[PDB]
Amino acid sequence: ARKYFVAANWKCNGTLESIKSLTNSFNNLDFDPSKLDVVVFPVSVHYDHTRKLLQSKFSTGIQNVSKFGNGSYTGEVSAEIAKDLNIEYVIIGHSERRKYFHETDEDVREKLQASLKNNLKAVVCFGESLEQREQNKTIEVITKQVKAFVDLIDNFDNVILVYEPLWAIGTGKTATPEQAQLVHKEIRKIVKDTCGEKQANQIRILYGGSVNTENCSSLIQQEDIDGFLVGNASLKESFVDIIKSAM
């Protein structure tokens, strides 16, 4: 059976003091990291503070990684640098980077290639817009986005997919757990047909829409939903209840 994976994407949020308070609350939750992956993704300049404050049962990662290696790339963090710091996970392709920073499918591919070369684990995000869903192109779009990078995956425990239902983010539309499940099953089929059945059955596919204490249980119970990449709710001490839903 697939190991569930609950991730806190703190995005661009936090102070040293707020992180102290929050990590303390997180540490109070008793869970078994051999059975459940729980990963916190602080801002880069908060990583050291966050890693020192969280018990090892919490895995940690960063919210982006360079498509380039070491060298003359001012402002970038290479996979090689991340590995030297023992940063375990990277987020790649988050919708906010595709939107504000014009990150492309090819950028996602190059970031994944660099990450896997340097023995990092990657949380790779994709998903269709409102316009794309309205045009009945959900499968077309997700197939293209996944096929941009999927051949790079060698170990299907080390790459974790995230479906962001962008059609239901800031649009006034909401995704039901069943609607999420349908897309997750479609994603797993795409992996099966491009990689193989064993590979598809191994890979974690997380929901990256709006997750909170009220809907987490309904989402995690869906057959093809293996966890979540959680936004605003992961900034609250009640995030521990979201973790509990996957325990």
Next chain:
Amino acid sequence: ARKYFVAANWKCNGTLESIKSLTNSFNNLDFDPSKLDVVVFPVSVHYDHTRKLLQSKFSTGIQNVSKFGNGSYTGEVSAEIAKDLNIEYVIIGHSERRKYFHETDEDVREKLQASLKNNLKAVVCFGESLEQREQNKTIEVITKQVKAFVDLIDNFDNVILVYEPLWAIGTGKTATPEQAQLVHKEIRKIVKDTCGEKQANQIRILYGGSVNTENCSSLIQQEDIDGFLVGNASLKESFVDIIKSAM
């Protein structure tokens, strides 16, 4: 006279071990930080390590900052976060970000605005390409780039300009100290035109082309060159000799 300013742009380079050795070597240099500013710009995830290892005479900063404040901007570091950590300096508009990440003049303006609002000191980069220089567009280009942000400066000690001779970076062309001086003179005139004489005479304008232990004195001794944003040479223990040129 203007206070000289010597900055190490480590770009995307370093390991925990190489930084330990390099900062230790830097610490052996006895300089007075009231007489010159010496600023180290490590990779974001190296900031805490670097700040801890460097003695208090060294100033520190980060290589980029967000145009957005706190919120849903995965992978970004806000000026508010930098303020909370007492990160003193930020680099804005580096050529590598304009090139690889399509950072625009408007982005530079907005990043400066966010930085100044949060009491961060900004090292703001600009400069013309080989094609632009060959078309005699140096002044036109630099005037436009400087005018994108210069009206925001409310304290001429807190913003530091950097001229990057992109025509002499990876092109096979070399900038002479004399050529660098003329551009710096041109830049200070633009600041005079837009902001006033006192303001122009106060602002540091650094050379951001290739600087090493051999050429550093020839550059800093020019009337309108107030220091440097140093690349490759700042990864070496001999960087102390570049600092010495400003002492």
